[PDB]
Design a protein around this nucleic acid. Structure first.
Ligand SMILES: [Cl-]
Ligand SMILES: [Cl-]
Ligand SMILES: [Mg+2]
Ligand SMILES: [Mg+2]
Ligand SMILES: [Mg+2]
Ligand SMILES: [Mg+2]
Ligand SMILES: [Mg+2]
Ligand SMILES: [Mg+2]
Ligand SMILES: [Mg+2]
Ligand SMILES: [Mg+2]
Ligand SMILES: [Mg+2]
Ligand SMILES: [Mg+2]
Ligand SMILES: [Mg+2]
Ligand SMILES: [Mg+2]
Ligand code: NA
Ligand code: NA
Ligand code: NA
Ligand code: NA
Ligand code: NA
Ligand code: NA
Ligand code: NA
Ligand code: NA
Ligand code: NA
Ligand code: NA
Ligand code: NA
Ligand code: NA
Ligand code: NA
Ligand SMILES: [Sr+2]
Ligand SMILES: [Sr+2]
Ligand SMILES: [Sr+2]
Ligand SMILES: [Sr+2]
Ligand SMILES: [Sr+2]
Ligand SMILES: [Sr+2]
Ligand SMILES: [Sr+2]
Ligand SMILES: [Sr+2]
Ligand SMILES: [Sr+2]
Ligand SMILES: [Sr+2]
Ligand SMILES: [Sr+2]
Ligand SMILES: [Sr+2]
Ligand SMILES: [Sr+2]
Ligand SMILES: [Sr+2]
Ligand SMILES: [Sr+2]
Ligand SMILES: [Sr+2]
Ligand SMILES: [Sr+2]
Ligand SMILES: [Sr+2]
Ligand SMILES: [Sr+2]
Ligand SMILES: [Sr+2]
Ligand SMILES: [Sr+2]
Ligand SMILES: [Sr+2]
Ligand SMILES: [Sr+2]
Ligand SMILES: [Sr+2]
Ligand SMILES: [Sr+2]
Ligand SMILES: [Sr+2]
Ligand SMILES: [Sr+2]
Ligand SMILES: [Sr+2]
Ligand SMILES: [Sr+2]
Lengths: 82, 143, 46, 56, 81
RNA sequence: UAUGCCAGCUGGUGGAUUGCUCGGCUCAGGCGCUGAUGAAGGACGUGCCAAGCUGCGAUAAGCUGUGGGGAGC
RNA sequence: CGUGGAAGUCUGUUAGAGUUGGUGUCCUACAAUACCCUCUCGUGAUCUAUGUGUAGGGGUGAAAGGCCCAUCGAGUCCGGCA
RNA sequence: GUCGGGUGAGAACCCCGACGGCCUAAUGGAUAAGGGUUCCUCAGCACUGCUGAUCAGCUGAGGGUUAGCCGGUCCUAAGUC
RNA sequence: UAGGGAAACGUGAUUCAACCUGGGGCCCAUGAAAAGACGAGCAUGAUGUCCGUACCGAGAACCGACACAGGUGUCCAUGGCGGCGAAAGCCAAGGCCUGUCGGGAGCAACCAACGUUAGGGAAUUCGGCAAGUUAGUCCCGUACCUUCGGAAGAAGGGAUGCC
RNA sequence: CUGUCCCAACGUUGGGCCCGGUGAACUGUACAUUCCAGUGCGGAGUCUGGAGACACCCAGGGGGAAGCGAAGACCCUAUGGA
């Protein structure tokens, strides 16, 4: 378990009106890479969802502090905001 | 589980719109077994099926604006959009003005201040548009 | 539209004709309803 | 307005209906005459020699 | 010659009218009136009819909702037949 | 030697072909009017379970009589 | 000066009606006449629903040979007819 | 639309919650015509659905429309027989 | 001491759709008919049959071969802010995520819709086609011509927020 | 007044491109890697002479196939029609 800062600047490559959707994909991709798990195994708690969608679908925050844990037999990650 | 049939029933039971009825995420299985309207009422009482509160637009910002405008502010040339006679109907203003002038003259006749001859002279002049307001009428009577 | 008593009987018959050929007829003849009418795709009388 | 597709939208009038006499959907409910059997026009059934080829 | 009562209409809604409202439901002949349905039920079951409500069903037949008096019990009349 | 060309083999696809005929086509002989005693035609019914066809008509794939027929239906 | 509130009157994407330009989009279409913006009329010779009438060398036509069920310098169907 | 979760052999699109949106003479409510069972329930996915489907206006089976006082019915209109 | 509401289970006011009732004006235009009702009381009792009644009413239940961006009548025209407004824009009630395929690449060329472009300013083109400019409201002010109505919002100039 | 132009640039959204799923049509005498000349019913990928040419695939804008679409509406002809 550790606290990570996820950069969400690559969501600018995706069209403006859909930024929140890509942000949520970037978060899952980052936690899968850094915690050495599969993207299917990363569980994002609704706190992260509400954080990225806070100012709508177009105005997403450039960064996001996230607390993630790593456990189990197959290997998975439960993640939340702070 | 498909709770859409119950959503329709809960909406009729609670007498609220479908989008405002809430179902407990932990009690989905119990709401799934809810076939009848009596089963729904039982679940309403258990607190499993609730109705959200309907929004009402806040009139606070409007009330503050209504106070400034009643005091004479926020009605300058840069705030007016309609034409002059649209903001105040000229026929309605004449109705307001002339009824007020005819009531003042009727009160002064019932008081004995003006005779039926003086009244007639002033009534006909008021009907001819000689007095702007009631104060302008009183200013003519007092010489 | 407002239907009469006779129009109602006719529409009723058309609905009854819309049923399948029973399971037992398939066994009796040793192996299809050609009058299969849909409310949208097909058209009735009147 | 086009005479094709946009003019087909106004078509919600009932004219031709099931006939009391012949059973065909040809009883014009406004004219009270059947276009198939002639019910409402004649006591005799509507039939014409041109409904078949001349030598048949 | 046609008979008035064809057969009893026994469905779940027909039972709710029998258990709670003392009403028996019948599938009758479509040429039969409310008064004719009333008489025929009294003459066949030895009951007293108060009100008859009819409907021309989408099955081509006529359904009649027949309410009996408080002296008669609808559940007891339906059990013997 | 990939992509691939020609012919064939095994298996498809397709339904020609050959064989078959409960349907047609044409010729011939016989016969030939029905209806207010409501025809012909149509509608809707009618079966244990019955959608189509056929039959039938609230006595509803049927009722009665006589003759034939026969151990099946 | 006021009152009055006339008008095939004006502005108006009110409803509603219409259809100038883009010769835009589409053009095996969403559509056998469509989409978007622009534009015109909008108390009157106004618009509109339903009912009703006029029928083919005949109707109907503020007239374009327009329209009479995607059909019109003579509708459609079948027959004449191979 | 997104994150969780539910059901399921199977879930991007079936259901629950949350978050985020869209519609305001309409994308809301009541109806005429016209449609004709398309309505509700259960069971289903061979068909139909611009992908998928456990969903459905689809498939199958059942069920459902109750009136002295709402319409028809009655009256007469242009007009028709 | 019906009903309904967890509860309270209000009182006054303004503007007032519906509905009621009057006054005026216009016509080379004159704005249905019939059944029925009233006129013509009260009690008690009986009777009141027959037909329709589901659902859709539309960017999927109608017409258009289609779950068609088309077409298709009525009533809700008084929900809040806004403003002249049944306008815009925003938001309730209510409805919806079915104008129903998705995933991925700072995502190239090219195309459709579109924003911004220095200096020049119609040189473009048959032609300012396309785009743009102007704009609401108040004050001042307003030419030729004219059928005296008009032209006319001519033009031109100034103002405009908040406290 | 201005991107109409000088003279074009950068950006925005949807496509376009790659992947899963769904899945048509137009068109097809045959052969077919062509180019330059020539010839031929005088407007040839196919004849003649040369030149060039290892095969397959992706994206592109459309030079050619006198490209595809429609038994030319112009013109003439018919002892044709209206
Ligand atoms: Cl009704
Ligand atoms: Cl008055
Ligand atoms: Mg005035
Ligand atoms: Mg059924
Ligand atoms: Mg009834
Ligand atoms: Mg008309
Ligand atoms: Mg189900
Ligand atoms: Mg659709
Ligand atoms: Mg410039
Ligand atoms: Mg030039
Ligand atoms: Mg222009
Ligand atoms: Mg030719
Ligand atoms: Mg010519
Ligand atoms: Mg001639
Ligand atoms: Na239909
Ligand atoms: Na029955
Ligand atoms: Na290849
Ligand atoms: Na004979
Ligand atoms: Na049968
Ligand atoms: Na005057
Ligand atoms: Na237009
Ligand atoms: Na004009
Ligand atoms: Na003719
Ligand atoms: Na979907
Ligand atoms: Na308002
Ligand atoms: Na530009
Ligand atoms: Na080319
Ligand atoms: Sr249809
Ligand atoms: Sr026109
Ligand atoms: Sr019509
Ligand atoms: Sr006649
Ligand atoms: Sr004849
Ligand atoms: Sr049924
Ligand atoms: Sr006008
Ligand atoms: Sr043009
Ligand atoms: Sr388009
Ligand atoms: Sr076109
Ligand atoms: Sr344009
Ligand atoms: Sr106007
Ligand atoms: Sr012929
Ligand atoms: Sr509705
Ligand atoms: Sr399957
Ligand atoms: Sr449904
Ligand atoms: Sr009548
Ligand atoms: Sr008043
Ligand atoms: Sr209803
Ligand atoms: Sr529509
Ligand atoms: Sr149109
Ligand atoms: Sr809402
Ligand atoms: Sr779909
Ligand atoms: Sr800038
Ligand atoms: Sr110029
Ligand atoms: Sr020039
Ligand atoms: Sr100015
Ligand atoms: Sr291309
Ligand atoms: Sr031609």
């Amino acid at each position: 378990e550790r606290v990570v800062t996820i950069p969400l600047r690559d969501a600018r490559a995706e069209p403006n009106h859909k930024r929140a959707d890509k942000a949520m994909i970037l978060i899952r991709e980052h936690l899968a890479k850094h915690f050495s798990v599969d993207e299917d195994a990363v569980r994002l708690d609704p706190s992260i969802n509400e954080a990225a969608w806070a100012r709508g679908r177009a105005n997403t925050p450039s960064k996001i502090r996230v607390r993630a844990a790593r456990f189990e037999e197959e290997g998975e990650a439960i993640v939340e905001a702070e | 589980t498909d709770l859409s049939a119950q959503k329709r029933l809960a909406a009729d039971v609670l007498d609220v719109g479908k989008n405002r009825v809430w179902f407990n995420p932990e009690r989905q299985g119990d709401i799934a077994d809810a076939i009848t309207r009596e089963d729904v009422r039982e679940l309403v009482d258990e607190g499993a099926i609730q109705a959200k509160d309907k929004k009402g637009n806040s009139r606070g910002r409007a009330r503050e604006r209504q106070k400034k405008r009643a005091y004479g502010h926020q009605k300058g040339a840069g705030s007016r959009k309609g034409k002059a006679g649209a903001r105040q109907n000229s026929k309605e203003d004449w109705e307001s003005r002339i009824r007020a002038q005819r009531t003042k003259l009727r009160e002064l006749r019932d008081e004995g201040t003006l005779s039926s001859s003086q009244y007639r002279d002033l009534y006909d002049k008021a009907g001819g548009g000689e007095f702007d307001s009631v104060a302008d009428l009183e200013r003519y009577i007092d010489a | 539209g407002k239907k009469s008593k006779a129009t109602k009987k006719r529409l009723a018959k058309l609905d009854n004709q819309n049923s399948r050929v029973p399971a037992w007829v398939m066994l009796k003849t040793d192996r299809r309803n050609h009058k299969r009418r849909h409310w949208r795709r097909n058209d009735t009388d009147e | 307005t086009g005479a094709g597709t946009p003019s087909q939208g106004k078509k919600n009038t009932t004219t031709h209906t099931k006939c009391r006499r012949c059973g065909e959907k040809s009883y014009h409910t406004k004219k009270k005459v059947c276009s198939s059997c002639g019910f409402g026009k004649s006591a005799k059934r509507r039939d014409y020699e041109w409904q078949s080829k001349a030598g048949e | 010659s046609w008979d008035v009562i064809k057969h009893p209409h026994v469905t779940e809604k027909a039972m709710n009218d029998m258990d709670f409202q003392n009403k028996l439901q019948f599938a009758v002949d479509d040429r039969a009136s409310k008064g004719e349905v009333a008489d025929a039920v009294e003459e066949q079951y030895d009951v007293t009819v108060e009100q008859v409500n009819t409907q021309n069903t989408m099955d081509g037949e006529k359904k009649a909702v027949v309410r009996l008096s408080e002296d008669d019990d609808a559940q007891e009349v339906a059990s013997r037949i």
